[PDB]
A paper describes a structure:
The closest human 14-3-3 homolog of the protein encoded by cgd3_1290 is the ε isoform, with 65% amino acid identity over 240 amino acid residues. Consequently, this parasitic protein is dubbed Cp14ε. With such a high degree of similarity, it is not surprising that the parasitic chaperone is stabilized by and therefore predicted to bind mode I, II and III peptides, just like the human homologue. It was crystallized with the mode I peptide RAI(pS)LP bound. On the third helix, the sequence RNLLSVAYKNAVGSRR (ending in Arg84) is largely similar to that found on the human homologues, familiarly featuring multiple arginines and leucines, as well as a valine near the end. Following helix α9, there is also an acidic C-terminus featuring glutamic acid - EAEGAPEAS, although it is truncated in the crystallized construct in a successful attempt to optimize crystal diffraction and therefore absent in the structure. The mode of dimerization is also well conserved, with an aperture formed at the subunit interface. The key salt bridge between the two protomers, previously identified in the human structures, is conserved in Cp14ε as Arg43-Glu119. Overall, this is a typical 14-3-3 protein sharing most of the common sequence and structural motifs seen in previously studied homologs. Given its similarity to human and plant homologues, Cp14ε unsurprisingly binds all three consensus peptides.
Residue numbers in the entry:
A (entry chain Y), D (entry chain X): 1002 to 1007
B (entry chain B): 24 to 59, 61 to 259
C (entry chain A): 21 to 60, 63 to 259
């Protein structure tokens, strides 16, 4: 659920 | 001579607009393998990344949806249906393995060896860590250990070079973003994730003032994702 | 045939999973294997899965076709002939995919689904689905090919219309028939008056009897009545 | 730009 680099 | 390059690049752009990314990736793949030791442009480099990111992204998203149902069934003691989900997940894994191996080969053989500037080296070292990470997401046993170790090394290697970029440089921030994610999700080392992201963010904040109008939003976009992860991670 | 009941329940399960996974080509194939392996009628659930599957399979290619054609034309308009021709070749590739997908579902319709349809409900559904797939082909065909597929679509929609006369004017299947059939007149045949007349007539006919809208339907029926108005509003300017 | 049945 953590965002990585778009 | 360089006519084919202009043309593959045109087609890659065209496939992106059409939202046909496996094709976008194959166009950009053909740019990479052709190159005489000439470096990809910033524009090309980004197109290769966008293409692979989307090609892999859609399989990752299905992978997660399929897994969740698998564990939903497993927990409702519906075994016949659980196995069906599993056979389908494996098939998506086969696709993930292919696409990740493809880009990683290009990075090992073509991209990482030919890169000059601090920019490029960080950029490509980060990509390799990312794609090893994607393999790590679904792998098991010794595959997982292996790809975990190559991602770690790639991010370390990228970290080493990144020290030559300003703490607010978007490429330096993005690395810390993905490197910290790697630590938390794959290595299950919440402390080292939190620290890494905290450090990257604090180091950037300490310097937001020493930036210009037309440049600070690229930085804040990413410092923002860093805070959002910290918020999630800290009880 | 106990092995046949399970094989069907299994493909339905996989069709539903492929949908959740958003892998529609494979969703279509699961539902196709349900069709090709049956005794002389799909249920409402399956029929709907079949339609959703083909609709999305073809939908993403339709959307790509439109974007590529647009770029092809901006190029032609810019005297950039090389680029255009490339766009052109790329558009053909997508056309070849469209052709295969439409022909796949039309073959199933022609040989399997239309012949075994009992209810007026399912007869309309499948005739409509047939005009739609010929319409999708007409969208990118030109000259003689367009005419021939436009004629197959026209006939399918008429056939659906004849049977639809047995459904209430408020029936969602009948209303959806009129929406697509009028879209077909407008977009494919370039007959704006027949289109406007057909959508108007279906909207007015439904509205003559809003008091007869059943509680099980008034949602989908109003939705469709609203798309009919939206199209009228557009076609009317 | 006309909408067909979803």
């Amino acid at each position: 659920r953590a965002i990585s680099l778009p | 001579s360089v006519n084919a390059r202009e043309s593959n690049v045109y087609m890659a752009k065209l496939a992106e607009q059409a939202e046909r990314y496996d094709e976008m990736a194959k166009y950009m793949k053909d740019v990479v393998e052709a190159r005489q030791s000439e470096e990809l442009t910033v524009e090309e480099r980004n197109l290769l990344s966008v293409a692979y990111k989307n090609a892999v992204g859609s399989r990752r998203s299905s992978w997660r949806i399929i897994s969740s149902v698998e564990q939903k069934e497993h927990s409702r003691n519906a075994e016949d249906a659980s196995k069906m989900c599993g056979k389908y997940r494996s098939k998506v894994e086969a696709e993930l393995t292919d696409i990740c191996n493809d880009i990683l080969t290009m990075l090992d053989k073509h991209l990482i060896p030919t890169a000059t500037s601090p920019d490029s080296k960080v950029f490509y070292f980060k990509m390799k860590g990312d794609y090893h990470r994607y393999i790590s997401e679904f792998s098991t046993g010794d595959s997982k250990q292996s790809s975990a170790e190559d991602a770690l090394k790639a991010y370390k290697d990228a970290t080493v070079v990144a020290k030559d970029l300003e703490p607010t440089h978007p490429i330096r921030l993005g690395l810390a973003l993905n490197f910290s994610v790697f630590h938390y999700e794959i290595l299950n080392e919440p402390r080292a994730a939190i620290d890494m992201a905290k450090e990257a963010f604090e180091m950037a904040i300490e310097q937001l003032d020493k930036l210009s109008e037309d440049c600070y939003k690229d930085s804040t976009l990413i410092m923002q994702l860093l805070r959002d992860n910290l918020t999630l991670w800290t009880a």
